[PDB]
């Protein structure tokens, strides 16, 4: 059977109540193995499955810094997107992103994906080729034009076809 590793990020703004809330969960098939919550007291990625606890401190460090840095990108984005849509500063808004990869029964790369949404609807997603973008609207098109000129697709493709598949295979074996 094939398998999948998927990460789900969620940033919710809260005007007059501090920085946005950031939650990140990682899945290997139907099993959640890690989690990050900006409102929790540890401020670090945490294990939620037994087979991941064995990972080293460098892993936890790296994964913690990476998700946090992503959360900061999301807060700049929450502002940018409010302007694109011309909404008030008082409302709360959401940015969601799911990304992952599927491997075959033999653990070979099958598919990869990186998709995001604004306020529960599609915004910008990377096409199957992992080389081009699909913009769901006018606002996303603005993003697409910037991104197609800065080659952010190549950055994601390297991860989705490289790092993603290789770690999924590690998780599959350790679990």
């Amino acid at each position: 059977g094939s398998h999948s590793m998927r990460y789900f990020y969620t940033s919710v703004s809260r005007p007059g109540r501090g920085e946005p809330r950031f939650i990140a969960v990682g899945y290997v098939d139907d099993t959640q193995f890690v989690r990050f919550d900006s409102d929790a007291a540890s401020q670090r990625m945490e294990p939620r499955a037994p087979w991941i606890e064995q990972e080293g401190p460098e892993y936890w460090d790296r994964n913690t810094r990476n998700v946090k840095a992503q959360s900061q990108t999301d807060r700049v984005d929450l502002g940018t997107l409010r302007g694109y849509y011309n909404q008030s500063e008082a409302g709360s808004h959401t940015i969601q992103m799911m990304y992952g990869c599927d491997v075959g029964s033999d653990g070979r790369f099958l598919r990869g994906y990186r998709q995001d949404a604004y306020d529960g609807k599609d915004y910008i997603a990377l096409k199957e080729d992992l080389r081009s973008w699909t913009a769901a609207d006018m606002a996303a098109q603005t993003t697409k034009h910037k991104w197609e000129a800065a080659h952010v697709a190549e950055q994601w493709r390297a991860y989705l076809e490289g790092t993603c598949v290789e770690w999924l295979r590690r998780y599959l074996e350790n679990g």
């Binding site: 990682g26 700049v76 993003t143 910037k146 952010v152």
Partner: peptide
């Protein structure tokens, strides 16, 4: 293993 942080703004 999480993807590197997105550096490109929307």
């Amino acid at each position: 293993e999480v993807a590197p942080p997105e550096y490109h703004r929307k």
